[PDB]
Amino acid sequence: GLSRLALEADLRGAIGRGEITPYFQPIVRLSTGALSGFEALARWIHPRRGMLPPDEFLPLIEEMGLMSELGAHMMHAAAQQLSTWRAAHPAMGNLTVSVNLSTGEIDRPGLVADVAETLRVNRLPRGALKLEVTESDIMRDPERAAVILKTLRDAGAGLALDDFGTGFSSLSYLTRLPFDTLKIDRYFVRTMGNNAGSAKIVRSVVKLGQDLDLEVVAEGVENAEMAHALQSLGCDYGQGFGYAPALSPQEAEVYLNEAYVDG
């Protein structure tokens, strides 16, 4: 309990010190493996414990009431990294960076202005920074969310629905929420091979994506066979260990540059 308490206390200063920082997992076109963007995922590079994963620390951030602070940091850091990459590769194709919105953030006063500020200082074009919003956050009050999403889109953010299948039936409300991207949870991707229900959900979501004109991104693409299975079903984008995990910025840079060189 003491080690956990020590870590919790460390959150007083860790966010400000930049120790909780984004790593970047590639999102690729499955047909060719071409890079489309990255998802920024929080990593706490603890000065003594080394790299800690979000499942270990996000509950502590929640208990400490520091979700907004983490979210602001992650947004700024992802956006700055994107701006740095764009300045270094001015002739490159599109490259998006996605950031996970901290729960309860969607309806926090000031979020739209914070997003707008981030886009302006980083000179980003519309859609380059994408916000991944969780089903629970959206479905807690879908009409309110619809308006905030429109305001975020108008400010210049791209928008993704993350974690469908949490339990709120977001799929049947999706026609009324202005997302541009839908993510398929790795649970469905991992189980579609052996379970008819999961296979059915993935086929159906790809179809809804086509009919609502959303980009569909499969998460947890662990290998070549999952990638081909997804492509046959009409899923064109994916992220997973079959490509790369969330990479340090130095590794991500090599990764993107190699994609730019063979584009």
Ligand X SMILES: Nc1nc2c(ncn2[C@@H]2O[C@@H]3COP(=O)(O)O[C@H]4[C@@H](O)[C@H](n5cnc6c(=O)[nH]c(N)nc65)O[C@@H]4COP(=O)(O)O[C@H]3[C@H]2O)c(=O)[nH]1
Window 10-29: contact mask with ligand X (x via CB under 6 A): ---------------x----
Interface pattern 87-126 for Ca ion (x via CB under 5 A): -------------x--------------------------
Residue partners of 48: CB distance under 8 A and separation at least 6: none
Q: Is position 223 an interface residue for ligand X (rule: CB under 6 A)?
A: no
Helix (H) or strand (E) run with residue 29 in it: strand 20-29
CA 145, 15, 82 angle in degrees (round to 5)? 65
Q: Does 41 bind ligand X (CB under 6 A)?
A: yes
Q: For residues 73 and 85, which CB has a smaller minimum distance to ligand X in the complex?
A: 73
Question: To 5 degrees, how large is the angle CA 170–CA 53–CA 238?
Answer: 50
- Say whether residue 132 binds Ca ion (CB under 5 A): yes
Which one among 86, 153, 186, 203 touches ligand X, defined by CB under 6 A? 186
172 is in an annotated binding site: no
Interatomic CA distance for residues 77 and 61, integer angstroms: 18
Q: CB-wise, 89 or 114, nearer to ligand X?
A: 114
How many CB atoms sit inside 10 A of residue 217's CB?
Answer: 26
Q: Work out what residue 111 binds among Ca ion, ligand X, none; the CB cut-off runs from 5 to 8 Å by kind.
A: none
Show contacts with ligand X in window 150-179 (CB under 6 A): 162
Q: How far apart are CA 29 and CA 44, in angstroms?
A: 29
Torsion angle of C-alpha atoms 194, 30, 239, 111, degrees rounded to 10: -120
Question: Does 220 help bind ligand X (rule: CB under 6 A)?
Answer: yes
Spatial CB neighbours of 167, under 8 Å, sequence gap ≥ 6:
135, 136
In the complex, the residues that contact ligand X under the rule CB under 6 A are 25, 41-42, 53-55, 58, 70, 74, 100, 102, 132, 162, 186, 219-220, 222, 239-241, 245-246
Q: Point out the annotated binding site.
A: 25, 39, 42-43, 100, 102, 132, 162-163, 186, 219, 222, 241
